[PDB]
Amino acid sequence: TLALIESAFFVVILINVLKHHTFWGLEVWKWCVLVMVIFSGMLVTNWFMRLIVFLIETNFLLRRKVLYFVHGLK
């Protein structure tokens, strides 16, 4: 799907001469890294949320209301 293609592209995306290039008065490598981080922020947040949900499931907490609120506000 569209999400899978974006995730694969981000994974694929993730040399002194190459980094020496300057764009708009800034390092080309730094700009590319920032762009990749911005693009993959959604995937990183989704992975973190999944990990948190998995940890909570294995946790000793058993409050249905608290669990429901956490699921809603995740």
From Swiss-Prot:
Tissue expression: Detected in the root tip and throughout the vasculature of the root and leaf.
Superkingdom per UniProt: Eukaryota
Signal sequence bounds: none
Subcellular location: Cell membrane
TM spans (from-to): 1-14, 23-43
Similarity comment: Belongs to the MscS (TC 1.A.23) family.
Function recorded in the entry: Mechanosensitive channel that opens in response to stretch forces in the membrane lipid bilayer.
Name of the protein this chain belongs to: Mechanosensitive ion channel protein 10
Organism: Arabidopsis thaliana (Mouse-ear cress)
